[PDB]
Structure 1
């Protein structure tokens, strides 16, 4: 009954949405945009099935790009410490097998068996990868199915399977050469390519550069953490679990607005005299839907307002407008 009162106070406190973001990653100072995205990932979009059987992805995939001195790994260790059904591994010192699934001999039966990789343990959950850019291309091309079709399909050793991989992926990435350079595109700052970058919903580019007031505040926070937030973890998780029971619907006024705001991203992404796309594929339209659904969950409303579309549109612009 007192937990029910906590949920009632949460929905009564109608600017809760800000308190949630500030409750994310409490050991990390600043980086409000990342914290917001992490909240929306943990809330997720809504999983859907079409009349033709085609599934449409619910999970939100995020990549956090920045210098190795940055707070990036502490974001991963926060989610790994906080989120149910979550796993942690490094891009180097892991293998495509240990990622999706392996095929091995059973010590009991002697014949072959499937052996579960991390993207199976993270099914209906989250997968957190450190040093993702330093992963072999052998293994980056392996997770392509799990990120989008949300399955691991296998045909090896006479054993055939299609195992579920409904995971939200969170990737800590370094730019090329380790140091970010905003004079280049996000295309140029990463060793990735469009097949994998289009599979990520949104990129947060947490570069580090000096600013004396921010630096004094950050230093004070770091030193105060060595002991010279709006919710407890239980309260935050209880709200997230409650919020995951909503299944928001696109209000009709949000639909046409979403079409136009996608068309603005679609226009501004275009490259060359051909007007070829690079970052805005159809996956990013679906990303706007998933993010607006996650926002509607963050607000505990079963309907998506056009404001939520605007927030998703702005969150996708973060990875583009730094031309």
Structure 2
């Protein structure tokens, strides 16, 4: 019995690059993980369900090139609306030509080629082992909530819904 990559990363991150070209066969597993996080196994007479709690980081490529003044985001990519709804957050990074930004981007890229070191700046790169140590320590921590905090969430949600009823544009 050989588990997949989704099962392999438990309490971890699955980085799915080029998610547009990936077939519906994998779309079934992606659909089921976000629903119940328990992968049903092949039909080779074992009837096994395996824990698959995982987080998903997907990278997408819009259909036929770049962003299109076609209004619907559903038109930009092939992904179904139901699949995109299960995603917690969606980020669009469109490449818009601006004369100022291109100069700094070119300078930043060329400094790396001239000198292999990254361009020195007031920003300090924190040591990666410290990154891992803090991330793990934060992961071990367990928060807790109060009744007063969640009361404002209801007001936020009702305001968002009252916006969404007219937000259809």
The CA deviation at 1:268 is: 3.8
Rounded to whole Å, the distance in 2 between the matches of 1:144 and 1:245 is 28
Question: Which residue does 2:128 correspond to in 1?
Answer: 233
Which of the numbers 195, 209, 228 marks the counterpart of 2:82?
Answer: 195
- What are structure 1's unaligned runs of at least 5 residues? 1-113, 272-320
Question: Which residue does 2:139 correspond to in 1?
Answer: 244
Rounded to whole Å, the distance in 2 between the matches of 1:163 and 1:225 is 46
Deviation string 1:223-256 (CA, Å, 9 cap, x unpaired) is 2233444412111111111111222223333212
Rounded to whole Å, the distance in 1 between the matches of 2:147 and 2:70 is 40
Rounded to whole Å, the distance in 1 between the matches of 2:5 and 2:164 is 34
Q: Which has the higher strand share?
A: 1
Question: Which residue does 1:305 correspond to in 2?
Answer: none
Rounded to whole Å, the distance in 2 between the matches of 1:242 and 1:255 is 26
Question: Which residue does 1:262 correspond to in 2?
Answer: 157
The CA deviation at 1:215 is: 1.5
SS of structure 2 residue aligned to 1:249? coil
SS of structure 2 residue aligned to 1:223? helix
* C-alpha RMSD over aligned residues: 2.2
**Higher RCO, Cα 8 Å, sep 6+:** 1
Q: How many residues are matched?
A: 160
Question: Which residue does 1:115 correspond to in 2?
Answer: 2
Matches within 5 A, 1:66-145: 114-145=1-32
Distance 1:155 1:135, change over 3 A: closer
Rounded to whole Å, the distance in 1 between the matches of 2:160 and 2:75 is 19
Rounded to whole Å, the distance in 1 between the matches of 2:162 and 2:82 is 20
TM-score normalised to structure 1 length: 0.45
Question: Which residue does 2:111 correspond to in 1?
Answer: 224
Distance 1:166 1:250, change over 3 A: same
Question: Which residue does 2:119 correspond to in 1?
Answer: none
Rounded to whole Å, the distance in 2 between the matches of 1:227 and 1:235 is 29
Larger radius of gyration: 2
The CA deviation at 1:265 is: 3.3
The CA deviation at 1:260 is: 2.3
Rounded to whole Å, the distance in 2 between the matches of 1:245 and 1:132 is 31
- What are structure 2's unaligned runs of at least 5 residues? 116-123
Which of the numbers 35, 38, 50 marks the counterpart of 1:148?
Answer: 35
SS of structure 2 residue aligned to 1:244? helix
Rounded to whole Å, the distance in 1 between the matches of 2:149 and 2:100 is 40
